């Protein structure tokens, strides 16, 4: 089955549903339900699907590198000023963005 809209926690508990394999394309919700390591795999799956769709192929290590940066703090750091410049990096580096 596939749904419009999400409620990952409640749907997992429903008898009949294989509770060990249910997947959502909102990784923000995955983080709240399954934790940071599951978010890593889900983030990778969603990026790869985008790139591979128009037949392109990017070697694993590049997409892997991007998602480790996005999950190293334990929460999702967006690639915007609100994420990037909340780091303990030097002021000259941060002000250049």
């Amino acid at each position: 089955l596939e749904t419009d809209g999400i409620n990952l926690a409640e749907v997992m508990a429903v008898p009949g549903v294989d509770s060990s394999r249910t997947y959502s394309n909102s990784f923000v919700e995955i983080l709240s339900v399954l934790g940071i390591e599951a978010t890593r795999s889900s983030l990778y799956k969603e990026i790869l699907n985008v790139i591979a769709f128009d037949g392109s192929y990017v070697n694993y290590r590049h997409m892997a590198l991007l998602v480790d940066v996005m999950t190293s703090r334990g929460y999702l750091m967006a690639i915007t000023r609100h994420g990037i410049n909340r780091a303990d990096t030097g002021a000259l580096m941060r002000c250049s963005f």
Binding site: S56, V58, N59
Partner: protein
């Protein structure tokens, strides 16, 4: 500045690291920068007015950094997709398919020139494929001179046997082509092709000579064979057109049936879709399959000698859809992922009546570019084109 000084060469926008590679200067008359043609691809350069930038290192330390890290042969394989980003292109790629056809033969007098055109040639003329009644070499033998020894590559296209009736696949043993037309699948930029293989076995220096050797042989041979294209090559014969016209005529009838069913409540609803979405979806699938079917008919009728077919088959420019649109049917025009909208009240143009959902009303261009477009079709084509 003098011969063999390294300089950094660069075209904007610098989207990835092979936008900046080190080249060796050769001073020449006339005011343009000259590039060997096989580097146009990584720069995404062409010669329609593009400009490029050159930077000269100013010390002993940076000259060495350029030649040992940034130099062109080191950049042949890119880390982006573990495959080459440079291959044989355009004229040389079109020509190398023609030259390595099974029935290309070259007499002795021309063969001697071609061997001498290879800078890396060892001076040993190879024995002709035919000794009697007249010495004749095949194209595959002379191309093989440009490939260094010790190179083995095997590829199977469509489960071919070692007897290769269709002259497809590829087999290379000790740097000599046993069988197989050489096309985009072997000397293009694809992974696992010829260029990738020479790089692993021989290193970047030898692999850089491979580009130069192949180019000098093929462009000479192609100069004396010639190649052209004309208006004749877009024209399918009268028998094929009636097939073409029938498949489009029958597709317009099926679209009529769909309109009838949807208006008489006899149409199946697709999951997740309203009636009008389902209706619009089914019509679009029918019309795109109609053009592909008509395109397939036009393609198969074209003889092997037809010049449009030779470029499509080589992979050097063009694809199936281009044969289809020049000769058979331009097909459905799309805007914002949907058919042409009713920008007038309930109609697409003031030359139609309201509530007309037929193919011609909502942007199906029946004619080919050869035949010429009608005025209604023309505007719709300009709408789709503008969006691009």
């Amino acid at each position: 500045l003098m011969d063999d000084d390294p300089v950094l060469f660069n075209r904007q926008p610098s989207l990835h690291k092979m936008s900046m590679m080190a080249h060796r200067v050769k001073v020449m008359p006339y005011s343009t920068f000259r590039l060997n043609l096989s580097v146009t691809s990584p720069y995404n350069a062409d010669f329609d007015g593009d400009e490029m930038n050159l930077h000269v290192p100013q010390s002993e330390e940076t000259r060495a950094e350029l030649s040992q890290l940034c130099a062109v042969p080191l950049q042949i394989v890119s880390p982006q997709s573990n495959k080459p980003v440079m291959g044989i292109v355009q004229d040389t790629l079109c020509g190398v398919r023609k030259m390595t056809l099974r029935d290309t033969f070259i007499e002795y007098e021309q063969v001697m020139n071609m061997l001498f055109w290879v800078p890396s040639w060892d001076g040993v003329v190879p024995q002709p494929a035919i000794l009697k009644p007249k010495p004749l070499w095949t194209g595959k033998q002379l191309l093989s001179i440009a490939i260094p020894s010790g190179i083995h590559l095997q590829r199977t296209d469509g489960g071919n046997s070692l007897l290769s009736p269709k002259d497809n696949g590829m087999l290379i043993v000790d740097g000599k082509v046993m069988f197989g037309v050489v096309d985009k699948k072997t000397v293009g930029s694809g992974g696992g092709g010829l260029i990738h293989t020479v790089m692993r076995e021989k290193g970047p220096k030898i692999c850089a000579e491979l580009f130069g050797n192949i180019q000098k042989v093929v462009n000479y041979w192609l100069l004396h064979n010639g190649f052209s294209i004309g208006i004749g090559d877009a024209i399918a014969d009268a028998s094929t057109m009636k097939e073409i016209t029938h498949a489009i005529s029958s597709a317009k009838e099926q679209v009529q049936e769909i309109i009838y069913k949807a208006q008489h409540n006899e149409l199946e609803l697709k999951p997740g879709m309203t009636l009008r979405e389902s209706f619009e979806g089914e019509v679009s699938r029918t019309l795109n399959d109609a053009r592909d079917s008509a395109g397939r008919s036009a393609e198969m009728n074209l003889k092997d000698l037809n010049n449009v077919k030779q470029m499509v088959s080589a992979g050097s420019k063009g694809s199936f859809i281009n044969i289809a649109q020049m000769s058979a049917c331009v097909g459905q025009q799309m805007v914002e992922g949907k058919r042409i909208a009713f920008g007038f009240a309930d109609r697409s143009l003031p030359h139609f009546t309201k509530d007309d959902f037929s193919p011609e009303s909502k942007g199906f261009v029946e004619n080919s570019y050869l035949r010429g477009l009608t005025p209604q079709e023309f505007f719709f084509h300009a709408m789709a084109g503008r969006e691009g």
